[PDB]
């Protein structure tokens, strides 16, 4: 029972880590608020939550919009009257392009969602988190640990997010609110597998070849799973981490070390 | 039950974090091996373990000595037949001296205990950890995050340990063995309180003054507790962290961020 | 003669570091392109350059505008026919506000100037830098080394810039173009002195008090001067640094170490 | 004239970087003290120095021995009466072995030379450096930026050295003494070429294959040269770097970024 009787808000619930996270939080005793633009996706996630016997509030939210984040906060406080944890899940799909071929509009949009969206959420729920002495976990990315070609827009936005997360730990720490980051690389599950299958066919190779190439830089020679990344997020969200704020915990089977 | 039916070896069991850690591992379902030079100290820790209903093997061990580490391994394998976790606890008491006034003998001894001792332990238990696909947690220190005057010998040894821990994650990762570090600053409990009381009298001030000065750089304006640092170590030792190796997790209430 | 017969473009020429930099580059044998929004400021800087016997091209440029950066490139290539160095000087004045009181518009504008402006410049001059196997120096900030309250918008933009600079080293390195950053804290000179004088009067203290407080975290107990920061930038721009790319060189008298 | 009328002590003068460094310092106007165990090697380096018209004092010194470092200091002060720069050059040849196969004696010896030797030198020359407000440059290594298998003993010693260098910047900064590090990877020149030739024959491949493999991780797809690493050291030793202390400057053509 890591999260018994806590309310956890997850923004950016997709079919992969987001769904695993919602399920895992519920298994650990949390009730959920699920936020995403497309509310049809939240329906099955909510079922996995309610199957554990917990509650799920699903709220269609564009976190780039002030009114919509205000509505999410209002609906949450109406349904539960409290928030213990806010998780900003990394939903936006990165495009591998060198900066030379990346549009400025794309990078502005990436910052809008990844940085300002997360800030809007955190700020919206600051009053709730002040009362609960709660925790924020921002899902970041291994991309901040390297400078590989074509990862620039993604590294830029994620780096701005990491920097913001760090300042927020300082600024919200006097209210007793913890703010940490979890930095996964590739995350193995059904979604990444389908993607590797597409890549395998498109490049005339095997999924094993693609998987092994992706995992080769790691110490363990395996990619972390959705559950393994979720476990790190749950730890940071929980009272096991009550002494921990301002930190980035990398979940990457050792590929980059910090 | 984070550590149900696991065997955990703790080296460097003292009255503070070490004792809390042993107790907490046992509460989470682990049986213990307790190693320290002074075996009289292990007696009360073993009682806290056996009070939870688990088992404790106490073995007097100078981890700077090959024969004594070999004996610890032999006694552990005779008693339990397996090891899932090795924790190298930071026992050695640092002396605040500028390098100019630090003896070379002191620094050699610090490296001997903090670095080579930990390596000797890890190597001794590598065969056991290979079979269990186990985990190593090395307790390091916040000192590696700054360069403050008089912390040099301590930062040097701890930095060498961190570097070694990182290489060990690479080298032992192919055997499926995880290696991580936990980096606490000051750790609040009975031991640190007595120390602050001594300092308070010796400098004509209050414990509150000393505590608040120590905590002022943190985001949360509190020092982490023995339990909070223990929780981080338990997480890293557990299967919740099965996707995590080569990492340093700082438990410092935000004073330094990484 | 560090920069003999090289052409150096400086964007963001202000009264402080920018003016010192232009003068110093010219003293080292460079001809200059000076770019800023307000062209009246470029007049006196150009005189300091031409007093050394070198040439200065002054071009009013809003580096947030595609057409204006295109014009700067065209005018430079018309006047000099080459570019060896591009320096993106940190001009924008940060406002100390917690994130909670910072407008999203302000942060978008900070990113626009500090990040996208610098990228636009670098991209505009990529063809020139390819031919010269030239160098880019982005002036960043000590703020990326800490998470102090009220520095958030500034740290966010500067961090995004640092991340971008690092990826650009990878992406432009195959064309033989070097990209490095110089990270100053406070920079002592006439401009910062006037500012400390304002602060001194407004807080009822001395300039010495303010200066000493600002310098207290440093190892040397002094702030770096405009010349000292300029020297670091000149080194990185020069062939002395031909083995160096992707690096951040902090000029802060030891306050933060990397 | 970066070092006009300065006295530069170089410890660990070998046939590669050390010889290039001595020559380059002399070309920039410095007089030299050359220290190494084997004094026969110092003879040709001293000739390259005196060919520039400067002076070279050659002193056979085991920097692991107190009396011998005391003698080096005494001979230097007798010959020149001052020291402006101390450079601890990385001489010791690393053995690629996993920790499991590395003897403790080897690692103690590596620390003795790389860490304690450098400290002994710095301390011996502290009185001289106090008077000159001088500078220390410790030649470190790219190995501190990664955790690759078999580099453990080398990373451990170099990491301890980096940590020590950082504390020394704090501790000696109040005397106005600067302390920085230069972190090269492979360094191209006659010595490394012979080594690649040996490897080429022993593995049945070309020097080009070996060179290109070594350079593949870099941004520039070339290894830094002895001159390029020397240039970085000269910069850090010089008054161009008078605002810079406590810093590590990586000279690696972009392979690792900090
Ligand atoms: Cl998702
Ligand atoms: Cl203890
Ligand atoms: Cl300026
Ligand atoms: Cl050498």
UniProtKB/TrEMBL annotation, chains A, B, C, D:
MF terms (GO), sorted A to Z: oxidoreductase activity
Listed Pfam families: adh_short_C2
UniProtKB keywords: Oxidoreductase
Family matches, as InterPro entries: NAD(P)-bd_dom_sf (IPR036291), SDR_fam (IPR002347)
SUPFAM superfamilies (UniProt xref): NAD(P)-binding Rossmann-fold domains (SSF51735)
Protein name from the UniProt record: Short chain dehydrogenase
